[model samples]
Target: MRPVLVLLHRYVGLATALFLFLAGLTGSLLAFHHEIDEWLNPGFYAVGEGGERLSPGSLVQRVESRYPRQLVWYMEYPEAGGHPALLATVPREAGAKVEHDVFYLDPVSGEEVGKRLWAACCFQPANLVPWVLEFHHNLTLPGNWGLYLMGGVAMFWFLDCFVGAWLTLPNAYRFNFDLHRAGGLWLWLLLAPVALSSVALNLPSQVFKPLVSLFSPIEPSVYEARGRLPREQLGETRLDYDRTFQLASVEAARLGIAEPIGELYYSFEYNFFGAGFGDHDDPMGKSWLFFHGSDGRLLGQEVAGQGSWGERFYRLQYPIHGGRIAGLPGRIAIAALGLAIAGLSLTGVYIWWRKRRARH
Candidate 1:
């Protein structure tokens, strides 16, 4: 039984080593993805500080008016003390010819800071953040099939993390043992969330949904649903912008968050990006504040704790994986966790090799 368990663990670890390392390393690097993106694509991310930063509503509205055909899904407000821009996205719909484009704007001027398409890195002044994210999130697999493969890896990895860690704890106290044990313990918290969320993002909805629902009231998450094709192209939208903003804020204020920031999500169709962490991009911080387009009513508030156990569990994923669970310190800690996993991967392979050799 012992050898069988260890052998199975070894087999899975060996098979997954390369991809797991990439996933872990990329995730750690992406913990500061916003900063990395800003550094790489100043044109697409940076804007003028020539004046006051505009209101969140104004910046979003500016993007919408400029690109009337684009249906807006998300508007990320400026990250405090980081960039001088806000991001607007018309997320891709099912069977859409083109992918979503992120529009950057000068808050004060509401001018188009610039835009980047899905292949953000291929463009000039490459955006390495999304460039690598393609690999980390989906293994660059087209039609998003890589996530399915990755989900299986994550499930195996979830078991391996514990099995290896458990074995090392009572071992002969060698340096490799300590390395393996310590890394496993530190990463247990961070990696579990990441590993499971990968499962949620990649697996079939019916299968994975019920598993995660055990922890919280499992509902279809933003990433879980397939985007709906517009049954018939609607002529125009009567969405009340001001009421959307006003009612959103009022609803948010009632939730007891500090100076609640509200975003007008036009289509309730696609909410999950399967990449971004927090509701907005504050490290380790979650802002569960969304509003309806037609009535300006609040839709979801995971950050504000407006869901069932399963819902919060699902929502808690990206934030924890992004290391915004605690912000800078959290990112740093998770970085170390990634290194630990890398170390354990090496040592585990060695241990397996040694044991196999002795048997032979």
Candidate 2:
């Protein structure tokens, strides 16, 4: 059993080493992506003078008016941290390709401060942070291919953690072995969760969601519940951002969600507006209210901590993996873990190389 496990661990470690290395390095950068992005491009999230902020509706109107070809589909409210600008995500124009789809606007004056592709294009200063995030998430592949590939890697890595831990129990005093064993020992708790959560996050629809369903009920997504509009029907929304927000506010008050609407998303396909309450950066998750885009009627909601164990577990995956649940300290730890993951990958490869050389 030990011998077979050793072979499995060795080959699996070799198989996943490079991918994990990339993931680790990229994840480390992404752990601090927001802060780093803001620092690199100050104009993108520049702080404005103290004043009243413009309504989401007004901000959308201004952006669309200026860039007639672009349509804003997502809005992120300015938070207490460095991001003082309202972020508007403009989906790529049909048929035509646009470099900059994400725009940052001064909330008070409604001025367009900066714009860039979130994670699509080349490694420009503006695109660096999100691009690294995209690389980490999906290796920047065209569709879900990169994500699935990483998910596959996570599965192997997750299993190997157990085998590696078992082997480390009574072994590995040599230099490379010591680094591998001791590093894995010190970081096993964090390392294992990161791997398992990556599997859940990257392969949600195909793997994790279904596995979760075995134990508890998983609610259908907004798109699944609301269903898509017929292609023939016009998808335009009658209610704008501000009105949808007002509707969400009333519902939230009744539901006892005191946090203001922190995020608003207009789904063209589903024909619904989702207003999320609380800080998006919050690790605990937030309450979300979905309303019909055409009539402003309430559709449904997904409140944090008010769901089945499976559902709640689904929500916590990203937070746990990204270290958002612990706030700054969590992020810092994740960043360090990223480096540790990278180090482990490199050391594993070095051990393999040394063994091969000795065999020759």
Candidate 3:
């Protein structure tokens, strides 16, 4: 048992240690992406006293007036305090082409503060963030290949943590493990949860089914019905910016909230439409209702909290990726974990270097 456990530990570490190091290092840096971005591009994010927050309508008008030729695609709300809204658009000359240009505007004044062309990394000196993110996720590979690769590495880490724990259990029990003061025990405890949760979170629904079945029959149809309902209702509503905004505004009023900070973006993919209708703005997060353009009446609304299990899980990916779960505490915890993972990777590399030298 001891020999087998030792072999498993060494093999897993040898195969995955480098990838794990990259994942941890990149993830840690990304934790504070917003904060770092704000620091690097102050003109776009800084808020001034007495600056009035602009409604969606006013913001759109301001952007259109300034860049008459550009087609506005979507608007993203400020994720952190004092950050400007992000308006994505394409240059007019490139008709029908998806514009990678991200315009940062003051919510109050609707004035353009900064512009970032997504593809042209050379345009913005701050492009390093996106560049790092791309490399971390994909090694700059295309499609979801990067995410899948990282997922595999995460699974490896998860397995190593478990195997390592099993191997060390006897020692831990005899000594009463103290991770902070003691090296190996504490490292195991700290690393185990992160590895476990990461694997659990990333595991596809195929794995979640049996686990969930313990509580109730896996209702595939429940999610399907939820996704299908919304599409059937909005069968042929021509997707237009005006209609999207109007419906979102009306829904916001129903909730007694102000206009949305960002534009409500929607898609017609199978996953979005297959399960049900009104999956656009999840009930959990801030989302507005949909309306038929011909009639100003409400169509449907999505709140992130009210979404189906699948929808909720999908919605949570952003917060999880950003490490903002549980608000400030979650962000702080994720940031700390990221740093710890980075430190672990660096130390592991140093240890490897020392061992190689001794052998020589």
Candidate 4:
């Protein structure tokens, strides 16, 4: 058993340990990127004081006046104070392959303070961040190759942790005051949370449903709309909208939310649960809802999630990467664990090198 376990551990370590190290290191670096980047590139991400809040409609109008020939795509409200709103647009007469532009605007003054082309193209400044993220997750490979590779590594890491822990128990009493020096103890401790979380994340929606269902109430049978209703059905839909808005408005009013401080964005897709609802090609199969201010009135809607299954999966990447499932505490914990894993990788390499030199 010991020999087999050792063989398995060594083989797995050789196969994916480097990739794991790279992923962990990059993830740790990106954890506080917003704060770090603010210190480095203040001009692009910061704003001046005494800035008043601006409504989405007003912001759209302001951007339109400045770049009338660009087709507005979306606007993002600043999550923090003293930050500018982000507006994205594509050139009106852009060719089939032309990329979009992203603009940072002062909400109070409606002035375009800074602008850059969307980073989706390769030539943009700070392009390496995205590339590194891709490589960390995908090994610079396309499609599901990276995910599968990571999943395999995660499984092996979990197994190695279990076996390594078992082997170290006999020396546990001696290492009580120095557990960090115990055989593989540091690596196992650090990798356990990452392995568990990665497995949970990689599980399919079908698998996730059973776990979530245990905690959540059984879903109702009400018909869910895909995208926005047609102009013809605006009357009927408006009535439903009125009801939803009223409920949201009353709740906000009770909470003393008067002016629109933020916008609520929601996206819907047909068969989100794998249950058939609408035609596959219909844009109505996917949608976005925009809620206005503190009033919670319906501000605007768009159909954007209508795409292939791969695209829908791609949309899930950010929330998963951000540790949204774990919330704030989870994000901090994951970030810390990621850093520990990275450190373990580096230290392990050094220890192995010293052992090799002593043998020689």
Candidate 5:
């Protein structure tokens, strides 16, 4: 059994070592992707003038009027520290292509500051962080293939965590072997979850969701619950951003969610208005309220910290993986863990190469 396990770990480690290296290096950088992106493209995230801000509805109107062909569908409310409001746009025509899919606007004046398609890559400074993020997530593959491949890699990495640890019991006294064995033993807890969460993130429908569903029912997304409506059945978008926000505030308070509404988005695809409460990118998770587009009917609400054990675990995957749960410190730790993963992969390869050379 031990011998077979050794062979398994050896071959699996060799097979995935390169991918793990790339993922680790890229992930270390991605843990701070937002900050790095802002630093690289200062113009894209210029601080707005400190003043009373324009309402989200007004900003949407202004942007839509300016770019008649683009429909402003999503808006991230500006933060208190003068962060510019970011809005996502969809073309008025179906399947139409646009140079930019999102815009950064001055929250105070509703003026466009900059715009770009996120994660679309090249050698440009603005694309650097997003490009790294894309690479870390999917190796920048054309479609779902990259994601599926990385997910498969993560699956192997996840299982190998155990096999590698088991083999470490009768461990190598040599330097490379000691490093490989000790690294996995020390970082096993962090590394295992990071790999599992990667599996969950990349293969949600195929693996994570189904697994979670077995224990605790997985709630369908707001859009999924409401589903697509026929053209005739799709009523007018009677609830504007302002009204939906007011409703969201009331609902959030009733639900005891203290986080302010950080994002207000009109899902043109689903024909619903959704308000995300708390930090727009909160890793611990944010509460959400979805409203019907036509009549402002309450469609669904998923509050943070209010779910089954399975639900809580499901919510935890991203934060654990991203290390945003503990804020700055968490992110830093995740970055360090990524480096550690890279180091482990290198040491494992070195151990394998040394054994092969000795045999020769």
Candidate 6:
């Protein structure tokens, strides 16, 4: 039994230990990712220590109107210690492939944080945090392939943690063994959620979609025509920034939302979810009020209870992994654990290396 455990540990530890280190190192960096970004590019994220920021409608209008037929993807407000503002969109001209028009604004006064053509583009000054997060999440690969790699890493990580803990009970004295064993025992519970959720998050759509379908009997609710403005109204010029923001603010208050975090600018998909972002639904966690492109009136919406279990969980995965929903304490824990995971990976490699050295 010990021998089998030893072999499995050695083999798997040798495989992708660097990637584990990569994940850990990057994850730690990401704990303060937004904070760093705010500092590096205050134009989009920072604001006065006092006074309140501008409304979403105003901020959206300020940035979005500059481009022709521009669609608003999402607008983010300044977080307590994280981001100050972020808004991005692309040209609405059909089939146009221009970059996502983006800006960082002061929420209080509705000011541009920076001036650039897509500041967050790869390796750009304003996008340092994004690059780090990208490496952490996707291993610097394109599409979902990075998630696929880490899904397996997450699976093996927990397995090794458990089995490795068992091995240390017998010897209990050696320094290397003790290091590996202790690291695995304490953090397994915290690590479990992160590891398990990776499968759901990273598995290619083809695979997980079928799996989700098998389990999810109730379908996600789609928007009806009531969710849209009248056909005739679609051609009318809608309210500009201030009026639209005013309406949305009033509506959000009615929905029990005192403070809205992110902004969903506009969409043509009519899929409400895609009304803001393109690839996937915007995961902004709050009561969302969708508006008409023409009159800028309420179209349709969904609150907390409106989504299916699958949809909710899909929304949950990001906050869970990133500790976004957990507040300050959880945020700190993720950072510390990130470094710990890297240490564990390095320790595993050290063990394997030592064994090989003794054999040699």
* TM-score winner, 4 or 5: 5
Regions of candidate 3 where Cα sits further than 4 Å from its true position:
46-73, 77-82, 90-100, 119-124, 170-185, 196-237, 249-263, 268-323, 326-332, 349-360
Candidate topping lDDT: 5
Query: Judged by TM-score, which candidate is best?
Result: 2
Q: Is candidate 1 or candidate 3 better by TM-score?
A: 1
- Summed over model 6, clashes come to 9
lDDT of 4 by residue, 32-143 (tens): 5454445544566665454466555567667666667774445555533667777766666654344337777776767777776533423335444555555555566556
**Cα RMSD (Å) per model?**
5.3, 3.0, 7.0, 10.5, 3.1, 6.7
lDDT of 3 at 286: 50
Q: Look at candidate 1 and give me any clashing residue pairs.
A: 54-107, 216-309, 216-310, 217-310, 283-324, 284-324, 284-325
As a whole number from 0 to 100, the lDDT of residue 180 in candidate 4 is 31
lDDT, candidate 5, equals 0.81
Give one digit per residue, the lDDT tens place, for model 3 in 122-203: 2346676666666665556676665666666767787888787777776432232222224475677767656644544445
Over the stretch 69-98, how does candidate 1's per-residue lDDT look in tens digits? 565556655543335454546533545553
Please give the lDDT score for candidate 6: 0.61
Models sorted by TM-score, best on top:
2, 5, 1, 6, 3, 4
TM-score on alpha carbons, each prediction: 0.74, 0.89, 0.65, 0.56, 0.88, 0.67
Worst 10 residues of 3 by lDDT: 270-279
**For candidate 3, what is the TM-score?**
0.65
| Colliding pairs, model 4 | 260-293, 260-294
Kindly provide the TM-score of model 2 when superposed on the true structure, using C-alpha atoms: 0.89
